[PDB]
Amino acid sequence: SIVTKSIVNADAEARYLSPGELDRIKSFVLSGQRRLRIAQTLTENRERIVKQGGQQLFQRRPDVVSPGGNAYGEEMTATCLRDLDYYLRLVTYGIIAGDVTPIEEIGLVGVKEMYSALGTPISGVAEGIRCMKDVACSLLSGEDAAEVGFYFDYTLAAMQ
Amino acid sequence: SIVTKSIVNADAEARYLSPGELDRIKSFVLSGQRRLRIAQTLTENRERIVKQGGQQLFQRRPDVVSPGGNAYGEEMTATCLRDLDYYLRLVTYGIIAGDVTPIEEIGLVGVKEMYSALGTPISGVAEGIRCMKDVACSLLSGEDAAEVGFYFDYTLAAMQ
Amino acid sequence: SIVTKSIVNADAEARYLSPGELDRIKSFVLSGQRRLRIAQTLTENRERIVKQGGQQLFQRRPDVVSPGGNAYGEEMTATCLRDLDYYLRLVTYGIIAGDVTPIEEIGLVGVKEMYSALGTPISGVAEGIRCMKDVACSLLSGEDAAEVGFYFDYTLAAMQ
Amino acid sequence: HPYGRGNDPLLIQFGAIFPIGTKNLKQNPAPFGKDTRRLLIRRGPGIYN
Amino acid sequence: MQDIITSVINQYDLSGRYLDIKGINQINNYFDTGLKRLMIAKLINKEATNLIKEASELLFIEQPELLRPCGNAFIGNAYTTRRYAACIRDIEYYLRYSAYSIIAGNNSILDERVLDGLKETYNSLLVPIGPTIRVIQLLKEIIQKKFSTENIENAIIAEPFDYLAINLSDKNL
Amino acid sequence: SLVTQVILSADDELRYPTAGELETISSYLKTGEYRIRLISILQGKEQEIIRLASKKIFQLHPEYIAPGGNASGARQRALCLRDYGWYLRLITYAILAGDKEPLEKIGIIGVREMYNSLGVPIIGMIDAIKCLKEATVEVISQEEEDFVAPYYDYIIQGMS
Amino acid sequence: MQDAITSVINAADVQGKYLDANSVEKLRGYFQTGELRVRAAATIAANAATIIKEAVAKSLLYSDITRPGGNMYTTRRYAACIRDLDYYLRYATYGMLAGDPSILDERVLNGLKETYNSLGVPIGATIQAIQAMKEVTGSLVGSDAGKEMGLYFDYICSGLS
Amino acid sequence: MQDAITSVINAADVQGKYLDANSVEKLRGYFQTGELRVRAAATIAANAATIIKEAVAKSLLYSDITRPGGNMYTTRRYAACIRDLDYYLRYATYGMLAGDPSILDERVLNGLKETYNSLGVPIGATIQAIQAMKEVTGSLVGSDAGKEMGLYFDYICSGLS
Amino acid sequence: MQDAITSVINAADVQGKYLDANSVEKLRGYFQTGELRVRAAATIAANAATIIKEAVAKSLLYSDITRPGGNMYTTRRYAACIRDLDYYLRYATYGMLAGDPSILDERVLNGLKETYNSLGVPIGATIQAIQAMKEVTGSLVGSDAGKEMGLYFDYICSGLS
Amino acid sequence: MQDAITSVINAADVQGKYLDANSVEKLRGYFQTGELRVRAAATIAANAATIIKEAVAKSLLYSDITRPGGNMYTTRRYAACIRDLDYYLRYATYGMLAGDPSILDERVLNGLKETYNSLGVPIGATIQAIQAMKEVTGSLVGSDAGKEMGLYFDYICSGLS
Amino acid sequence: MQDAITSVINAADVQGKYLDANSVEKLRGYFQTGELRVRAAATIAANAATIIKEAVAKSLLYSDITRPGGNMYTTRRYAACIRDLDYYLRYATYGMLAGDPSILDERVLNGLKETYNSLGVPIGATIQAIQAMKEVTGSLVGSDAGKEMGLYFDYICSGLS
Ligand SMILES: CCC1=C(C)/C(=C/C2=NC(=C\c3[nH]c(/C=C4\NC(=O)[C@H](C)[C@H]4CC)c(C)c3CCC(=O)O)/C(CCC(=O)O)=C2C)NC1=O
Ligand SMILES: CCC1=C(C)/C(=C/C2=NC(=C\c3[nH]c(/C=C4\NC(=O)[C@H](C)[C@H]4CC)c(C)c3CCC(=O)O)/C(CCC(=O)O)=C2C)NC1=O
Ligand SMILES: CCC1=C(C)/C(=C/C2=NC(=C\c3[nH]c(/C=C4\NC(=O)[C@H](C)[C@H]4CC)c(C)c3CCC(=O)O)/C(CCC(=O)O)=C2C)NC1=O
Ligand SMILES: CCC1=C(C)/C(=C/C2=NC(=C\c3[nH]c(/C=C4\NC(=O)[C@H](C)[C@H]4CC)c(C)c3CCC(=O)O)/C(CCC(=O)O)=C2C)NC1=O
Ligand SMILES: CCC1=C(C)/C(=C/C2=NC(=C\c3[nH]c(/C=C4\NC(=O)[C@H](C)[C@H]4CC)c(C)c3CCC(=O)O)/C(CCC(=O)O)=C2C)NC1=O
Ligand SMILES: CCC1=C(C)/C(=C/C2=NC(=C\c3[nH]c(/C=C4\NC(=O)[C@H](C)[C@H]4CC)c(C)c3CCC(=O)O)/C(CCC(=O)O)=C2C)NC1=O
Ligand SMILES: CCC1=C(C)/C(=C/C2=NC(=C\c3[nH]c(/C=C4\NC(=O)[C@H](C)[C@H]4CC)c(C)c3CCC(=O)O)/C(CCC(=O)O)=C2C)NC1=O
Ligand SMILES: CCC1=C(C)/C(=C/C2=NC(=C\c3[nH]c(/C=C4\NC(=O)[C@H](C)[C@H]4CC)c(C)c3CCC(=O)O)/C(CCC(=O)O)=C2C)NC1=O
């Protein structure tokens, strides 16, 4: 979160928190009412955000679901959508934490080692998160879509 | 306290707490208002309860303060009253804990090894606590003096 | 030695050493001058005490050296005398330690398992030590022969 | 152990084998309260624990 | 470390579930007192160099032994000014990490950066643990002197200082 | 400034700024002019404020003004107001770039050795800044002085 | 093994000072909830077998740990579970009365995750059983009492993780 | 567990040789001090409680380990000390008689510093108690006997460090 | 390493001035574009790998530096390029946020053209790789944001020349 | 760190004797299998990623250590596994060439089981991963070569237990 | 502690299926060798002391572990060997009857190599004693029975290594 790494920043520097750090912990907690509303929208829209998320993913990447693709059959396609439910969950954590620190140490650190070791095309799962982003930002206003989309594209950046 | 050993009793027996155990935790916490009043009386009467406590102790045991006694001189007599301030403090803990469990593992377990190893007559320090008991119960009503005196005589019993 | 097991005796009993134990550690160390003289006699008489030791052993037990005996030939007879040099050495340790504690945990504990597992007649090696005893006590006065012989017959007792 | 790790012997048929010592260099002191219960395992079934 | 929020999110990740409303009610309790947690922190920065000074005199006024020779026990109290200089320095830390930990709303920063090895370090230098904990709560009463007319700031200020007290104790009971 | 701290702090990890940091730049730039409007308020009150600072730094500390003190004499006191002018000028920089670096890269880093080589008592300069913050409250309303309050006491924390 | 009163007395004693206003302030807060904890521990004692039967049927009853090969297959292994889940629901009751989770790590948590790894017991299914057991416990004792009893369940789940 | 005679016999036995002039030369040196060690162990047995009472009052009696919060506060904890100091004065007496410190690390030193770190016992105050206990022991047994008994005290203090 | 709002705290300050109307006039001009720069730096962070893949395929593959003998032949040498082009697209993002190209010559430009001459890296193809990378960056962030991000690309190309 | 030749030379040197018929008899036995070990280490180097992908999918891919709460949940934790399994398949390749498992306990086994207990890594699932990894390794290198490579896998599993 | 029948029943039970043709196929293979194992265990019981006397005299009787300083010098230490070798020849007899080496690591192998390192027992000489003991055991029970009894000796030697 912004609270924990604004601390560990000033922790390492042998000092307390500046006004630049304490006027933002202050600014973040007054932002906390609006963050829970945004995460509350994505919380009980996972049925559509995931299922329509895998909608565009297969239309854009039919190789991964075709015979020979990693997510082929009734089995892998279920797990094919399971990971999108994971990453959609971590974005709800990042929105409430005000940072990608929850998304950092979960689903991002060493993610290329996992998916390379699973045989999954890491570029394909990046395409899946982008398809979820258009569904997510279509569910919110412009002021919110600059945030909810904002955490997806960070996940897109670290996932390639 | 009564709460912690009524738990560890039922803890060892692989069971929860009976009505006999839970109607007494209930009965003890409603007793908690009256316990703090009793301990509040002994808290800021330690000046008289200790100093008059060592009053009767020297009149009844002049050997311990006479030349050759363990508490002889300006030095040991100060520590001679220091221990009474300790044991008067533990009785305030036992009254609020509703048990001699605080007095048990502090000032009672292995007390004979300490005082035998210090050269102090353990019977003499038992006489000191009895003198404090008459001063303490003289400061409270009959309903309270059956408690505040009740914890002293347990300390008298374990101290011999 | 007498010093180490008089300690471990009083060690187990949670106590110090009595006068019965400390007037014998005292009595043993004043005996130490006479012990080194006795062990000094057996130290550079091993050439005769061993070679004459195996002298009477073969005259009394020709089976062990005859063809079929365990110590048959140039080879085994050399090792046949090697063990006597061992046990003659341990008796020099027991004389200086004032006890068979050195002889106990060396050459006595589990000795029947070794010699039974080597095919050696354990009674035969007991006969060898007795032959060494008559040679050893013939090298010392009566006051000493009651000691040097005294440790051999303990080895005779434990070796059967 | 409630004292350090070099205190529990090897559970062999017949022992007095404490591996942690001055020769092994594998020690680990941990703070244990005055009361605490180690989690032993029943050599046998599970409900007789 | 982990604030009240990240500690809450790890609570729901271990179970692998989304944030329910009981989870969000815990977050909202931080966001309500979050604005109040700052001027507590902002008061400490304005009162920092003072609040250590009142803590020291209130400490040594009851523990005059700490300013005296140690006895033959080579013990580290505030005997010499070299000892006194470093010994005031520890009160810096207890006020500091208990100032961040007021803002995080959780004692995660306390134990991993203050408590871990604290009894280790003081047992090496033979440092007082008794007086060391008492100065921690002399600060607590001193800080609570400012916010006293109401009583919902008091529980906030007490939580970091109370956590160091219970944890630095050799457990008598 | 604050963006410089984000570019630097993101540059030692070899990554673009994350989701939380871009908030910290975006929220800082949206509060832009209010720092700009505020510094023009303070620049019009620099002759306002330093006259009030010399009120109480010297009635509190007549040691420095008296004959023998460092500030004794006209030209010593002449720069005395100049140091207030530079500090107040520095705080207008810090109020604008919303952090402590202009108060830290200048003024704070190594200030004690500067004064100690000058003879100015370093404790007196702490009260001088505390005096300066006491003087800024009068010519400033309650809305914006707690905006500028955390920039002052950082200087006091830096000087100890 | 300290309750809320023992922990308050320890911290106030470890500095050698008396029980000031802050120490008694928390003690008064514990005595206020003393009535709630007993009734919470009352109903949990009554429905001990019913709560554990509800948790296992709601979390891990039909999963393939229950089937052959799963970690809970044989009847000795199944019977060890409800024996094992009984301690979590029991020791959590003790923490709810004592108001301090010191008894859990003293008598449950230490050597626990190190023991399940030895046996090969799945820590993932264990926590979800306790989470489901926490969910039914909030049914009986109510909301705030469930908040109290639930506060020690996840303490077990956190340390056992 | 070897005395001076056991250690001399072991080294002379471990090479398979007899007790030559050098091995008996040290043994004669041990028998010469045999009279001194018993009288040293005699008076130490008599004044065991008096020596420990003198050491604690001279080293750590009034320090703040003795006060609340210190490592020696409660009566169980204080009573453990004089029980604990009794072993150091007792086992050092055994080393003084056996003339070999093998019994100390066999029965005292091993797992000792690793145990005090577990309990949180201050090793610094422990050694100064033994140093003060070594100082009073030189009072009773004399100078050279104190040199002998003192030679095993710092052996405990060295390894316990 | 100065931003816009930190280059005006050098000029209004290295001579010892205050922040008059002209100094704040530029600062207000920087705060107006503060919203544009973050969104520009937002999309560039997302499409970092895509932008570099577009630039190299549009400009320097196509010309026998990619073939054997060319300056980019071996896989270590090819991999150094996209590593190398990542800094130009990254540090240009920093200049776009800070609004001042001081970070470029501080951390990129100094010793850069003197380094490529040592390795023998073709400065001509490098500038084309950045010009094409500037062309795709104007695609994503828009026209004026591309004008801002593009203003630091040619600053690199100018000094690197 | 000794191979079969180093271990043979050490034992023949430690007695100060030359390489007699028995020492060279084992050395000839090692040179006979020298051709088998290189081809075994050849294919294992080629199919390193494929073998580890086969083992985890066959042993612990879908178990609840893989799910939330299990010991392998987060991507950092999953990525540590295949990093961790790579050493077992790699160091076992070294033991297969050197013909002596001294390198394993020198560089893998010591402080390993003591480290997994610290992290809380399940030793039970670890050995079954290595057992499954041993099963696929016998597929590639053949029967007898699998017997050789398999002889060092269970050496890791034995000591790691 | 499982025999061949116990291991067959466990694997067939652990999947919850009946004893199919493959499970009974191995069981019939075990019953065919049931006559061979008893006669193998018959003669080994008769010549237990003779086999151990033959192994030590053939492997480590005259080596310098037998001489002073070697690991087997004193009579207590020598007597511990034949006591120790008796377990290897005895437990190997149990594995030969049960047809499964589970009893060895259950009751012999675990904590064994970790124990010899504590005592300082040479693992190298230990395995050669068991190898020589395996060589004489093939003399008595014959070729194939020696192949069976020999199959558990090197199992001890492998894990003890
Ligand atoms: C919270 C962060 C996080 C992630 C992301 C995660 C992923 C993860 N993905 C898995 C499998 C899988 N993942 C896929 C995924 C895909 N197939 C496709 O074609 C697509 C490109 C893609 C999905 C959009 C497939 C097919 C499997 C099964 C592979 C197999 O069975 O071999 C597995 C192994 C089975 C399991 O335990 O679920 C894990 C652990 N774990 C985590 O903790
Ligand atoms: C909380 C439980 C508790 C107790 C009771 C306690 C006792 C205690 N009593 C002591 C001394 C002492 N105590 C006495 C006591 C007495 N002399 C008499 O004649 C009377 C019979 C008696 C008192 C009524 C004297 C004379 C000394 C000093 C002895 C000396 O200097 O050798 C000391 C050593 C000095 C010190 O550190 O204070 C301790 C630790 N500590 C504890 O933690
Ligand atoms: C210090 C205590 C101690 C003893 C006693 C000891 C004995 C010992 N006697 C041995 C052999 C032997 N010992 C004998 C002994 C005898 N043959 C006879 O006829 C006689 C009855 C008897 C001697 C008086 C023979 C013949 C061998 C060789 C056996 C063989 O080669 O199979 C061996 C094996 C070879 C060697 O390493 O020397 C040992 C270890 N070791 C010890 O550490
Ligand atoms: C009071 C604190 C405390 C706890 C918690 C404890 C646990 C404990 N759980 C055990 C076994 C077990 N525990 C389980 C549990 C489970 N299987 C699953 O699939 C589930 C995830 C889980 C039920 C929630 C099973 C199946 C065994 C038997 C393992 C075996 O036979 O190998 C054993 C082995 C001995 C025995 O049960 O008799 C102990 C000691 N001991 C303690 O002192
Ligand atoms: C962030 C948490 C944290 C703490 C608290 C900490 C403490 C700490 N206190 C120290 C020393 C010390 N601390 C004291 C303190 C005291 N003396 C008394 O008598 C009083 C009881 C007490 C003051 C309250 C003294 C005297 C020393 C020096 C000991 C000596 O050299 O004699 C030292 C060794 C010097 C150094 O700092 O390198 C450390 C590391 N380190 C940390 O990382
Ligand atoms: C931008 C940060 C900055 C500062 C602050 C600074 C200070 C500074 N103060 C100085 C002197 C001085 N400063 C003082 C100051 C004071 N007397 C008092 O009573 C007061 C509390 C205090 C002023 C408010 C005096 C008396 C001297 C003259 C000492 C001497 O030369 O005898 C000098 C020597 C030359 C000069 O006066 O310019 C410097 C450089 N330089 C810097 O770059
Ligand atoms: C060369 C000899 C050698 C080994 C073997 C070794 C292991 C080792 N494994 C580690 C972690 C780990 N190891 C695992 C492994 C597993 N999780 C499971 O469920 C499986 C059973 C298992 C895979 C087979 C995991 C998940 C971690 C991360 C633990 C954490 O983040 O807390 C770590 C911590 C640091 C790091 O990974 O960077 C070390 C040092 N180090 C060595 O030097
Ligand atoms: C049933 C499984 C099992 C085994 C195997 C076992 C071994 C074991 N071997 C021991 C000692 C010993 N083992 C030996 C063995 C040898 N010296 C050599 O040179 C040879 C290489 C080797 C004979 C083959 C010796 C000499 C000792 C005594 C060590 C000593 O006194 O320090 C001891 C110490 C206690 C005692 O013997 O009473 C144990 C516990 N325990 C078990 O429960």
Side-chain angles (χ1 to χ4, degrees), chain E residues 10 44 99 169:
Chain E
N10 283 327
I44 294 190
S169 175

Coordinates of all heavy atoms in Angstrom, one line a residue, chain E residues 10 44 99 169:
Chain E
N10 N -4.0 -9.5 3.2 CA -3.3 -10.8 3.3 C -4.2 -11.8 4.1 O -4.1 -13.0 3.9 CB -2.0 -10.7 4.0 CG -0.9 -10.1 3.1 OD1 -0.9 -10.4 1.9 ND2 0.0 -9.4 3.7
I44 N 3.6 14.8 17.1 CA 4.8 14.2 17.5 C 6.0 14.9 16.9 O 7.0 15.1 17.5 CB 4.8 12.7 17.3 CG1 3.7 12.0 18.1 CG2 6.1 12.1 17.6 CD1 3.8 10.5 18.1
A99 N 5.8 6.1 16.1 CA 5.1 7.1 15.4 C 4.6 6.7 14.1 O 3.5 7.0 13.6 CB 5.9 8.4 15.3
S169 N 8.4 -7.7 28.0 CA 8.3 -8.3 29.4 C 8.8 -9.8 29.4 O 8.4 -10.6 28.5 CB 6.9 -8.3 29.8 OG 6.7 -9.0 31.0

